[PDB]
């Protein structure tokens, strides 16, 4: 899993 | 943003 | 499963 | 940012 | 896994 | 910065 | 999969 | 951007 | 997996 | 920039 | 991976 | 600048 952001 | 592979 | 946007 | 390999 | 920014 | 290797 | 834009 | 291989 | 951009 | 072998 | 940019 | 061969 990935989390992409601010 | 995005969130993957949850 | 995944979530894109704020 | 990112968070990879969740 | 990585954590990239701030 | 970048934390790698988690 | 891929998101293109900003 | 471009965000690869989701 | 790739990100590109700012 | 380019974040690349996520 | 590589990360390139500031 | 670059990090690479993480």
Same mark, same amino acid.
């Given at each position: &899993?990935?989390?992409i &952001?601010?």
């Open positions: &899993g990935a989390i &952001g601010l």
